[PDB]
Design a binder for these strands. Structure first.
Lengths: 253, 351, 254, 253
DNA sequence: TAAAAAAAAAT
DNA sequence: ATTTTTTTTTAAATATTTTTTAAAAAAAA
DNA sequence: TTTTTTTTTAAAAAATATT
């Protein structure tokens, strides 16, 4: 296993996003790329992390090995890398240690980091065939702002899909809080563009603690691809440009 | 037990007591009286006044307290030599007569107070009725053998053995609440070496060499000064306390110059006042040889100690397992070297 | 009798921000040749050798030798009452129980006199032999602070090895292992980035990391750490204070 | 009630000023303007807020309501607002709801925040108007710097006014602060604009912890107006630019 | 084995 | 009025845990 | 680059079990 990554800040932001919600995760390393369907420390939210081999520089893998690592210790090791450090993963065939080489951008400061591993394995749950009813491609800084706003009111956000826009209704001890979005006139690609598709009406109640954990993937991708239906869990998707996606699943309340 | 010695060094030489925390000792071998810790953990560790009665009928309070004291004392890198108490000489028989009549007064007052129902005074006067036994020290030395910390048995007194262990250079210091170690001969004495200690009552590192330099006297005259303070071996002159003994020692060096220039109608010399034998017992006590003994901090057996404390001392499995894991990670790493080994002091700086 | 006008007193603020995390009480060895502070840690592991020479002070007129026992967290709380442009003027009176610190702003509108209290201290001054070191490594200070801050997450002790290719900051702990290698470079256009290693023999030593993280608070002074090593001589972590002298941090190995 | 601010950063800075010492406040609005005369939980200092109706972009009030607003929660609702939102306060004359509508001027996010308001019949303590001795006008960043300077010294500042300038001074167990400013008569209009309005030598003792909560109002104005005399409480006036003012009252020690 | 505090001749 | 000593009495942890004061460190203005 | 802020750990509080 040798997975070189020139944009190692992508992997650092993945570990910053996943350090507060999953403590111990299995890393289903396939030949197609880095894959993860781990689940949180509670029994509420599912995380489907996919890092394909196209965005990696040189990806080599021989067998479908699953590494149960500690995501807090791995995030503390990913904090040792810089924001422009080239990160080369390395796993031995027999030794259960994950070697991380944070090469410098000028290739001066070579930073070899060997990580101990545990042996925690969990059952695998895949994508249960979502119809993708309401797909809200909206900016991730705005979704982080919306969840950080409505976490200060209560633990219940009410999201309603419509043609003219999307609502974010929250109520609690402080009072009523609604946040309404709209479309965008000019065709802009990533930022300031809330694009919503519409098949059937939906109105669901979500927790703000797990959504506040979900909004820590804001520096990964600029666009949150929300996806939900009636009695279908909310898919907060974090499609990275060079490889894969980070899917956050949340059952309604 | 020298009355008014630590207060004398505190109000005369605050520079000699290098006051510091438990963080300030890395790899320093410290020879500790066991019996002081055993009484501290039979008195302070209480079940409401029941001294941790286990399910078999023994007393597991002191093993609990000094076990966790020893685990947190390897967490700070201090290497303990738990020197156990010895058979006391004939000079301490009067002090044990005083302790026996104090225990008799405490027993009579405990039997008076248990009828009255004042349960706090009952707890106080059963805390004043703590007696060391052969089985307490035997099971405590068994615990030292099980957890890998070396121990010594004194022939006469533990303070003399600790002071000659510092005097031979085998250990760095003595950790006694007793102040006798400055007169049995230890140049460096720490006090209040406890485990749970951040800022509440930190370590008073007394220095015998510093106080002998700043008051300007040798070891024999300091021994005589602590005779006139009043030790637990022979009595003192009535009417002479800290400051009068300091002034008469600094004006009159030998004990004969203390004795013969004193009128009996104002400062009497007491009857059977054996200053010479207490002087010889502070200079040359019955001490086991510190060069002959060996101090080795062996690796403890983990699960055997766990089944010992959970089979007949009634502890928790995870608690003793966490303690042996804490000492095992304490002994795993390399020792932290000091800076005064590599650099030599030229001179101090004033204010 | 002692007056020290320092126009660039931002680096004096950086000195006392570096000092407060390591030692709390110290004595300034103030002489007419300059201002010195050779004070040792309370755990007796690490020494701070300070030198502010009289050439860097723009008005230095101190007559005789003065030793001033000072609480350095209190002195740093006094020096946190000045910005990054003020002319910090050290002033001491006759039989100086107070240190007058005048923080004159350079636009001459705000003059902040801080006469701050002292204490009586009897601190020892160790004897440092002036002897050459085996591995003299001259790295950037921000990169060294980065290295110590990353390796403090894994374990409490780096195991630093000098070698032919360069210095290696190996460290291990309960999170696994970490090795940071630094090749000697000379092709960069900046002289601050050029990691210069003066090799005599390859030497491997183990140093604690709480003290190294205490040492790397001096990194706002200049971007030059002169790591100096030998077989069992303590590590010198030397910071060039700008045109006064050094902040030589000493550290006994393991 | 319908009050609209074209720049709601003034209202957000007012609530971040007033959330630290006033916990519960009464917003005695009127047709003439928005007013507040509430006094803190320590019952030692009076806060006078004047928000004129000319500074509001769209103001409308006819009943002259007397609502009582929980001030930390409504500062959290202003923390939900952005720094450039067109904030529309609203209150119906039959219900006890304080509606807040935050509208970005370019971005399409319109967010509505209702509130529950408790009943507050708290009496007013109207200060008299009198000529003050030292009506020193100094920069707000300078006063925040001086209060954060002398707050490390102790909990007491003596403030002396003379011909040369204002002289702040603090004494404590750590040392003795003495911050002496100067009268500035410059024409170039730099960052320092310390003007003296010198009438009579005064020297008064004020608490510095309290004054740290007082100078939490720093980004409202570039300059403050410490108007004070020998026995009356210190008046710290935060002249908002053509919008109103925030007067702060502190009794001397 | 320690100390504080108060009573009481020494000061 | 101290100065000094000697009588009574009062005492002698530890850890885990939760809940707090204080000091930082990113992540933005 | 430095602010202030917001947040997250590393010291004391403060009893309770420790048994």
């Amino acid at each position: 296993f040798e997975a070189r990554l020139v944009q190692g800040s992508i992997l650092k932001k993945v570990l910053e996003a996943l350090k507060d919600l999953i403590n111990e995760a299995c890393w289903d390393i396939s030949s197609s790329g880095v894959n993860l369907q781990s689940m949180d420390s509670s029994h509420v939210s599912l995380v489907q992390l996919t890092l394909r081999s196209e965005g990696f520089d040189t990806y080599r893998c021989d067998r479908n090995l699953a590494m149960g690592v500690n995501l807090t210790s791995m995030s503390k090791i990913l904090k040792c890398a810089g924001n422009e450090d080239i990160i080369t993963l390395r796993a031995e065939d027999n030794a259960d240690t994950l070697a991380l080489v944070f090469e410098a951008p000028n290739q001066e400061k070579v930073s070899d980091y060997e990580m101990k591993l545990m042996d925690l394995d969990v059952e695998q749950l895949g994508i249960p065939e979502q119809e993708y009813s309401c797909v809200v491609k909206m900016p991730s800084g705005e979704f982080a702002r919306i969840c950080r706003d409505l976490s200060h009111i209560g633990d219940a956000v009410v999201i309603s899909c419509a043609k003219d826009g999307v609502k974010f209704s929250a109520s609690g001890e402080l009072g009523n809080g609604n946040i309404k979005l709209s479309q965008t006139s000019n065709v802009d690609k990533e930022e300031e563009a809330v694009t919503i598709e519409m098949n059937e009406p939906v109105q669901l109640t979500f927790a703000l603690r797990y959504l506040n954990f979900f909004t820590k993937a804001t520096p990964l991708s600029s666009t949150v691809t929300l996806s939900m239906s009636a009695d279908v869990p909310l898919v907060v998707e974090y499609k990275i440009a060079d490889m894969g996606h980070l899917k956050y699943y949340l059952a309604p309340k | 037990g020298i009355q008014g010695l630590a207060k004398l060094i505190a109000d005369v030489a605050p520079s000699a007591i290098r006051e510091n925390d438990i963080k300030s000792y890395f790899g320093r071998k410290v020879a500790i009286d066991a019996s002081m810790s055993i009484y501290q953990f039979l008195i302070a560790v209480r079940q409401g006044g029941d001294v941790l009665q286990n399910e078999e009928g023994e007393t597991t309070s002191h093993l609990m307290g000094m076990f966790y004291r020893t685990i947190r004392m390897m967490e700070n890198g201090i290497k303990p030599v738990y020197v156990f108490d010895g058979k006391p000489p004939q000079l301490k028989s009067g002090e044990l007569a005083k302790r026996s009549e104090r225990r008799a007064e405490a027993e009579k007052q405990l039997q008076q107070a248990q009828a009255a129902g004042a349960e706090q005074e009952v707890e106080k006067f059963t805390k004043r009725l703590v007696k060391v036994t052969k089985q307490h020290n035997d099971e405590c030395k068994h615990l030292l053998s099980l957890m890998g910390i070396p121990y010594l048995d004194a022939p006469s007194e533990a303070e003399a053995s600790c002071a000659a262990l510092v005097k031979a250079g085998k250990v760095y210091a003595a950790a006694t609440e007793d102040m006798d170690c400055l007169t049995f001969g230890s140049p460096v004495l720490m006090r209040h070496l406890t485990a749970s200690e951040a800022k509440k009552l930190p370590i008073q590192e007394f220095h015998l060499s510093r106080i002998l330099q700043e008051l300007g006297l040798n070891q024999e005259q300091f021994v005589d000064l602590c005779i006139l303070l009043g030790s637990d071996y022979c009595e003192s002159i009535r009417g002479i306390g800290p400051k009068r003994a300091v002034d008469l020692i600094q004006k009159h060096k030998s004990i004969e110059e203390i004795v013969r220039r004193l009128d009996p109608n104002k400062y009497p010399v007491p009857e059977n006042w054996l200053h010479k034998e207490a002087h010889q017992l502070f200079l040359e006590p019955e001490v086991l040889d510190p060069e002959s003994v060996e101090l080795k901090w062996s690796e403890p057996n983990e699960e055997e100690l766990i089944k010992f404390m959970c089979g007949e001392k009634q502890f928790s499995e995870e608690r003793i397992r966490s303690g042996v894991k804490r000492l095992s990670k304490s002994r795993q790493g390399s020792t932290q070297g000091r800076l005064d080994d590599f650099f030599k002091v030229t001179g101090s700086l004033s204010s």
